[PDB]
């Protein structure tokens, strides 16, 4: 839950992209704190919605 | 006694509008807001919009 956080905000310090691969935590889904974050695997929200 | 608000994203802005809407209603004095607008400044070439 802590490993992918720094590559998010440190990159966003200049607003440069970071692409995630298999992150499961839903905290990064917010568009404000991590505006420059992307995800490749679906989050838990949609597997709940199914 | 009349005003209108407009803002873009990011400053957790939902709390601002929620608080102002909650506070405006209760008091006896009749504030009458009109045409609240939400604007997206991230749109590319959205100047015409």
Provide an overview of this structure.
- The structure is cut from a larger assembly and holds chains A (50 residues) and B (49 residues).
- With 50 residues, chain A is an alpha+beta fold.
- Chain A contains two helices and two strands.
- Chain A has helices at 5-12, 44-49, and strands spanning 18-19, 37-38.
- Chain B contains one helix and two strands; from the N terminus they run βαβ.
- A two-stranded parallel ribbon of chain B has the order 1-2.
- Chain B is elongated and about 45 Å long.
- Chain A binds chain B through residues 31-32, 35, and chain B through 9-10, 12.
- Chain B: This is Glutamate receptor ionotropic, NMDA 2B.
- Chain B: Belongs to the glutamate-gated ion channel (TC 1.A.10.1) family. NR2B/GRIN2B subfamily.
Number of strands of chain B: 2
Kindly name the structural category of chain A: alpha+beta
**Straight-line distance between termini of chain B:** 29 Å
Strand order of the largest sheet of chain B: 1-2
**Content-based structural category of chain B:** alpha+beta
C-alpha geometry of chain B: elongated
**β-strand amount of chain B:** 5-15%
> Level of helix content of chain A?
25-40%
Report the largest inter-chain contact.
Answer: A-B, 3 and 3 residues
Helix content of chain B: 25-40%
Record field, number of beta strands of chain A:
2
PDB class: transport protein
Keywords: ionotropic glutamate receptor, synaptic protein
Entry title: Phencyclidine-bound GluN1a-GluN2B NMDA receptors
Chain A: Glutamate receptor ionotropic, NMDA 1
Q: What is this structure's SSE topology?
A:
This is part of a larger assembly, with chains A (50 residues) and B (49 residues).
Chain A: H1 5-12, E1 18-19, E2 37-38, H2 44-49
Parallel strand pairs in A: 1-2
Chain B: E1 6-7, H1 14-26, E2 37-38
Parallel strand pairs in B: 1-2
Features:
part of a larger assembly, 2 chains, A: 50 residues, alpha+beta, 2 helices, elongated, B: 49 residues, two-stranded parallel sheet, 1 helix, 27% helix, Glutamate receptor ionotropic, NMDA 2B (chain B), Glutamate receptor ionotropic, NMDA 1 (chain A)
């Amino acid at each position: 839950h802590f490993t992918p956080t720094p590559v998010s905000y440190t990159a966003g310090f200049y607003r440069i992209p970071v692409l995630g691969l298999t992150t499961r935590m839903s905290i990064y889904s917010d568009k404000s704190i991590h505006l420059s974050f992307l995800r490749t695997v679906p989050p838990y929200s949609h597997q709940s919605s199914v | 006694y009349i005003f209108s608000i407009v803002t873009t994203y990011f400053p957790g802005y939902q709390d601002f509008v929620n608080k102002i809407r909650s506070t405006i209603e209760n008091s006896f004095v009749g504030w009458e807001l009109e045409e609240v607008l939400l604007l997206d400044m991230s749109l590319d070439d959205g100047d015409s919009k």
